[PDB]
Design a protein around this ligand. Structure first.
Ligand code: MG
Ligand code: MG
Lengths: 146, 73, 64, 145, 67, 189, 57, 143, 52
RNA sequence: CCAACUUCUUAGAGGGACAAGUGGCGUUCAGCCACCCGAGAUUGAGCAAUAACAGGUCUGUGAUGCCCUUAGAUGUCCGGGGCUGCACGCGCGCUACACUGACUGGCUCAGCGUGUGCCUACCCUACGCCGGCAGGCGCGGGUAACCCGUUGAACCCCAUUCGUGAUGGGGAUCGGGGAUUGCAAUUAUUCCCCAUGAACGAGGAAUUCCCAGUAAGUGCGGGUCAUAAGCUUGCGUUGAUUAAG
């Protein structure tokens, strides 16, 4: 039903080493999930306070006008939860760069930067390939002499 | 020092339910060296003191089951 | 022998020593007057502006 | 519900020739029977319709005798044919699960039968050498002087 | 590990000595100048010339260096 | 305000000894929710100082191959052992760990390549990062050779050794081995 | 016959270029050969020599 | 309100449906169900006694996520780590003719149906009753 | 190494072919004036069937 | 046309960082030290000089000089044996030596890449149905971003069983049986089952490899291939203590 104010919605991602994960954060009422299931029912569950972490220190009721859902492709069990974290870190930032003023973008980015300059900035380091004489990316095979 | 007596005698069980709910670090690897039981009854006896209501659960973890004494406050 | 074991803040890093770079050289100050100083040698990374602890105050200067 | 102990407790049992220890549970105590391993044990205890949880010192001779009977011959009690030890034995043709010292009867019986007709593998058991196609230039040293 | 090679310092002396009045103390201005005025093969040595240019746009604007 | 593992705010922990203030990092700027941070700590030095000690201690716990990449099993050991601390004392468990940094960090240790006073010759002092670096390591190794051929769980044995080192009564290994290095450095002080 | 895959198309015409290079080097050694260039057409196809002496070739 | 399987603890949803098919005894239990070893990459008999029911739950639960998974697609998901001892370990297939029996066990239970291609999807009779007991187990968390 | 002696070197000849794609609805007599317009040895273009 | 669009996928051009800005240094020289902006303020490898070693390879090569051998052939086909034999020593490498573990059952997330032939005949496999496993038959797709295939990998995680025992740790050794490969498995090709259960309880003198996605645990993928990986070469996951001398 495309009637009343459709598609007031930015789509913002987050990557770490393969795991790209994108939030299609619409206008709605307090709904965050990954692939349909809610946040607290996730695979790690020992890291259950670093994938709903930005909704903790920034707010539930401040950030309950949205119907975030995230699909995930790539990565691993530590990669994908930082990826959806980075997805819901900077999506509601970029929801605030456009559909309101930068008074609220300055309000939340200033929290997100001063704590872990890595919630919303991409991870630079990557796989860094093997070499042709050793077992790993730096090491060599064991040298013998006699 | 080995095969230390699964399936309690009567000389240890009357000591167990005397003060093992009383102290606070109630853990299977502690009650199996402070007593002379070899454990996996350490897991068995601890579950039924939780079943009676002498002790309280904290962990519910697979590698570490943590309990405490009764609230005497 | 019986002395209060004393915390101490450094002046400038004066370079490595100890034939392998495993000692540094810090020349601490003894927390009370700014003129009482002794040249010393600690091991561990420095970060100028720290406070290290002296087991005793009268040992040796590093000069042969 | 076993919380202290009953009045009786087989301190060490005695089954056929290998006395199983009384303070393990059943599937891991009867492994000492050379012919009942750890994997063969669980099928015995579940075709007997006994309970798998109890230790060794708390089964009386009613239940043990049904455990002893079906592991004495597993064939006629609905245990499949490619699960046994001496499948298609070369003196009978049948399927004969040996348990006791009879397992050591038929073990040497392979060695002496091959030693009698002078095959290659009969020579390798006779010699102080490996059998199953292993190299011996730089492995298998402490089995010799 | 920073110190720029001679073929940067040789090619960025003839820029500043011959085109002094077309230049100034902003980097992004000078990057388009050498883009247009000297045939540079790739970008990586291009702006590395222009780094020494602005470094000497703040140098010979004060003193008489070999200019 | 930070609720370390969902609980035990970093407000009450008073860093008291002045030699070891700005190298212990449970401070309000540098308190996290739980110790699992994307590191980047050995590209340039001296940013592994303001890293919170809860991060450093859980990283230095998995050592020997079969426990080498396993980080979300070595953090629940810190999550359980802080909780057992609250059983034995009823304390904000961060405060009792930083006293274990205080009471197990050495002061004196010997350095010389060649001929021997003990193996080294010359005892020197310690910068107030290296004795903290040796503080988090002495708690792990002192917990590790008391849980190897022992029925005791490593989460108990961690929780046993550090608060016994935090008081300090020559019972945990981080007191009886640390004072060995200080005494043999006094043998050639 | 029926057609074959793309990664072995590209070593087919690669090994086609390598072989007539080796033959014409042995064939045109005394005439200043200096390589060949191929053109593939779906008609009469088209190859050239780069010979120094266009007499003896 | 509207409750799916997805918003529910799917670890103990397995126990929610292993309790379900055991009590509603229409399921087809094979005769060899205790001499199995379960998918040769592991070397002991299964510790649970009614393991065939809790294996029948997950092959319904995995089928609700992705459609159309045949027998070989469902073998290679229950595979694990085969320790060959002194040689290094590997990954390996499950067992087809225990995955084939259990998918034929839901066949007579009428939760599953064959496909246009090869493979099996679960019929919407299968999705209407496991989400109801997903609603039953969700309200069991709060009570 | 053409022998077995050396110090364990390993060179990596890698070949990377690219590919693009274009549709047509057009009649295919003038498919012949798509083909014969460049001599161009460095292309490998293919003609998809016009049976539709 | 019975919808648009490019954030995520694929690339294509171009833009992007230069030590530019701010301070302290030094001959206000080249530059160094951190800070601010920033995705990033050392991404990692390929190629690589002059002059040489009596380095190795004549068993890659109809590259090759000379010598030797030339039909009772060092040519070459055919069957069998050996290239694998064991009082001993040496070098790479896997598994381990548990409780941070191991079982059993659940929950689970990837990248790199290969695939049917002029010769040479035999590939990737989905599915269906027979087997407690290894497997077997019919039906298909794929010359491939078109099919295998969103590559449901392992570690992990939660759930149970086991408790410091040479034990359910270890699985060498070794018996019997079952299938697949092929012209042939015997001197065990490989795979599977049941049974057997050795040292091994953290390692002498000495020594290697490496400092950021790095060491390492952890699997998958090529290459050799009919059967074939404890090897090698690539891949991703997990992921560090210590160092700036
Ligand atoms: Mg132990
Ligand atoms: Mg040759």
């Amino acid at each position: 039903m495309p009637s009343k104010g459709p598609l007031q919605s930015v789509q913002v991602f987050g990557r770490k080493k393969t795991a790209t994960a994108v939030a299609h954060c619409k206008r709605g009422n307090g709904l965050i999930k990954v692939n349909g299931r809610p946040l607290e029912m996730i695979e790690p569950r020992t890291l259950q306070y670093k994938l709903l972490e930005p909704v903790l220190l920034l707010g539930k009721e401040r950030f309950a006008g949205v119907d975030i859902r995230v699909r995930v492709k790539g990565g691993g069990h530590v990669a994908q939860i930082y990826a959806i974290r980075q997805s819901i870190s900077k999506a509601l930032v970029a929801y605030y760069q456009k559909y309101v003023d930068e008074a609220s973008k300055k309000e939340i980015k200033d929290i997100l930067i001063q704590y872990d300059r890595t919630l919303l900035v991409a991870d630079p380091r990557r796989c860094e390939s093997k070499k042709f004489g050793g077992p790993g990316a730096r090491a060599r095979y064991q040298k013998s002499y006699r | 020092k080995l095969n230390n007596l699964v399936l309690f005698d009567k000389a240890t069980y009357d000591k167990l339910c005397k003060e093992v709910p009383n102290y606070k670090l109630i853990t299977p690897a502690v009650v199996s060296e402070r007593l002379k039981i070899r454990g996996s009854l350490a897991r068995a006896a601890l579950q039924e003191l939780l079943s009676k209501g002498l002790i309280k659960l904290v962990s519910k973890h697979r590698a570490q089951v943590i309990y405490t004494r009764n609230t005497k406050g | 022998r019986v002395q209060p074991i004393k915390l101490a803040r450094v002046t400038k890093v004066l370079g490595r020593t100890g034939s392998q770079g495993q000692c540094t050289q810090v020349r601490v100050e003894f927390m009370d007057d700014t003129s009482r100083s002794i040249i010393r040698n600690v091991k561990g990374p420095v970060r100028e502006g720290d406070v290290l602890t002296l087991l005793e105050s009268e040992r040796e200067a590093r000069r042969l | 519900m076993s919380l202290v102990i009953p009045e009786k407790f087989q301190h060490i049992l005695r089954v056929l020739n290998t006395n199983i220890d009384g303070r393990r549970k059943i599937a891991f105590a009867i492994t000492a029977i050379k012919g009942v391993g750890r994997r063969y044990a669980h099928v015995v205890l579940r075709k007997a319709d006994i309970d798998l949880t109890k230790r060794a010192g708390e089964l009386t001779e009613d239940e043990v005798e049904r455990v002893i009977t079906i592991m004495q011959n597993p064939r006629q009690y609905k245990i499949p044919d490619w699960f046994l030890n001496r499948q298609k034995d070369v003196k009978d043709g049948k399927y004969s699960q040996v348990l006791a010292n009879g397992l050591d009867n038929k073990l040497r019986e392979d060695l002496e039968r091959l030693k009698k007709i002078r095959a290659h593998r009969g020579l390798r058991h006779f010699w102080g050498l490996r059998v199953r196609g292993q190299h011996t230039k730089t492995t298998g040293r402490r089995g010799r002087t | 590990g920073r110190v720029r090679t001679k073929t940067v310092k040789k090619a960025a002396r003839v820029i500043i000595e011959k085109y002094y009045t077309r230049l100034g103390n902003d980097f992004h201005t000078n990057k388009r100048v050498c883009e247009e005025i000297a045939i540079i093969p790739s970008k990586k040595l291009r702006n590395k010339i222009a780094g020494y240019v602005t470094h000497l746009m703040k140098r010979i604007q004060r003193g008489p260096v070999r200019g | 305000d930070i609720k370390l593992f969902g609980k035990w705010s970093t407000d009450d922990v008073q860093i008291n000894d002045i030699s070891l203030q700005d190298y212990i990092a449970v401070k309000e700027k540098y308190a996290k929710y739980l110790p699992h941070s994307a590191g980047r700590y050995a590209a340039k030095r001296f940013r592994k100082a303001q890293c919170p000690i809860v991060e450093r201690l859980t990283n230095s716990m998995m050592m020997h191959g079969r426990n080498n990449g396993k980080k979300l099993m070595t953090v629940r050991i810190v999550k359980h052992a802080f909780e057992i601390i609250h059983l034995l004392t009823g304390e904000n468990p961060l405060q009792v760990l930083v006293n274990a940094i205080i009471n197990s960090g050495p002061r004196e240790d010997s350095t010389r390549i060649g001929r021997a006073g003990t193996v080294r010759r010359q005892a020197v002092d310690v910068s107030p990062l290296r004795r903290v670096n040796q503080a988090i390591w002495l708690l792990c190794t002192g917990a590790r050779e008391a849980a190897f051929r022992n029925i005791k769980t490593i989460a108990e044995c961690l929780a046993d050794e550090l608060i016994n080192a935090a008081k300090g009564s020559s019972n945990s290994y981080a007191i009886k081995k640390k004072d060995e290095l200080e005494r043999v450095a006094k043998s050639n002080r | 016959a029926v057609q074959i895959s793309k990664k072995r198309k590209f070593v087919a015409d690669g090994i086609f270029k390598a072989e007539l290079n080796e033959f014409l080097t042995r064939e045109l050694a005394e005439d200043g050969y200096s390589g060949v260039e191929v053109r593939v057409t779906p008609t009469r196809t088209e190859i050239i020599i780069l010979a120094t002496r266009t007499q003896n070739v | 309100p509207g409750v799916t399987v997805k918003d529910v603890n799917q670890q103990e949803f397995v126990r929610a449906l292993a309790a379900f098919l055991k009590k509603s005894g229409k399921l087809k239990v094979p005769e060899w169900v205790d001499t199995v070893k379960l998918a040769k990459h592991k070397e002991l008999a299964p510790y649970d006694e009614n393991w065939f029911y809790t294996r029948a739950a997950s092959t319904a639960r995995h089928l609700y996520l992705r459609g159309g998974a045949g027998v070989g697609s469902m073998t290679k998901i229950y595979g694990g780590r085969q320790r060959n001892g002194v040689m290094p370990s590997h990954f390996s297939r499950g067992s087809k003719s225990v995955a084939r029996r259990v998918l034929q066990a839901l066949e007579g239970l009428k939760m599953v149906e064959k496909d246009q291609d090869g493979g099996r999807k679960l019929t919407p009779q299968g999705q209407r009753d496991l989400d109801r007991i997903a609603g039953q187990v969700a309200a069991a968390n709060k009570k | 190494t053409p022998c077995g002696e050396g110090s364990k070197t390993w060179d990596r000849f890698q070949m990377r072919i690219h590919k693009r794609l274009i549709d047509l609805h057009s009649p295919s007599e003038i498919v012949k004036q798509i083909t014969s317009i460049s001599i161009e040895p460095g292309v490998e273009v293919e003609v998809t069937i016009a049976d539709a």
